[PDB]
Design a protein around this ligand. Structure first.
Ligand code: CL
Ligand code: CL
Ligand code: CL
Length: 163
């Protein structure tokens, strides 16, 4: 565990993280994909051997000794708001299980279903709150990665609102 487990946010490519493992915003078929998933494919391609896993689940594959946790959030273009919300919560619960099992002291995590799986809606708060629900009972240092300047401010404010 971390000595004083924390939440932080950084605005940069998750492929350049300084944590002991990474969560991929994966597709269910283990394809290279786009966005976070393509950056992860370019950085850790070995981790996509048998990474295919259903929506709402997480599957870890080692790149050397570095764990890549493939977490499959729902595509809100296909799911109802209700079913998508349930699967998005489930995917983060499976990330907390894997982080715990691996015994890491830190993890880099993107906000699942907020990019091309968002169904064209702003899901910062919905996705972040499911991340907190899952990760709050873990003792890893969590570092959230984003790319947008206003998202960085809103994520930083939500973290600070606790503490
Ligand atoms: Cl960068
Ligand atoms: Cl996405
Ligand atoms: Cl972002």
């Amino acid at each position: 565990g971390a000595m004083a487990p924390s939440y932080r946010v950084k605005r940069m490519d998750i492929a350049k993280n300084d944590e002991e493992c990474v969560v991929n915003a994966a597709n269910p078929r283990g394809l290279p994909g786009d966005g976070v998933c393509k950056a992860v494919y370019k950085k850790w391609p070995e981790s996509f051997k048998n990474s295919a896993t259903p929506v709402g689940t997480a599957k870890t594959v080692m790149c050397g000794t570095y764990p890549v946790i493939h977490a499959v959030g729902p595509n809100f273009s296909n799911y109802t708001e209700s079913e998508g919300d349930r699967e998005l919560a489930a995917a983060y619960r499976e990330v907390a299980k894997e982080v715990t099992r691996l015994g890491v002291n830190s993890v880099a995590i993107p906000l699942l279903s907020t990019g091309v799986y968002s169904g064209g809606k702003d899901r910062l708060t919905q996705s972040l709150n499911h991340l907190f629900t899952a990760m709050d009972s873990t003792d890893a240092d969590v570092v959230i990665y984003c790319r947008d300047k206003e998202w960085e401010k809103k994520i930083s404010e939500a973290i600070q609102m606790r503490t």
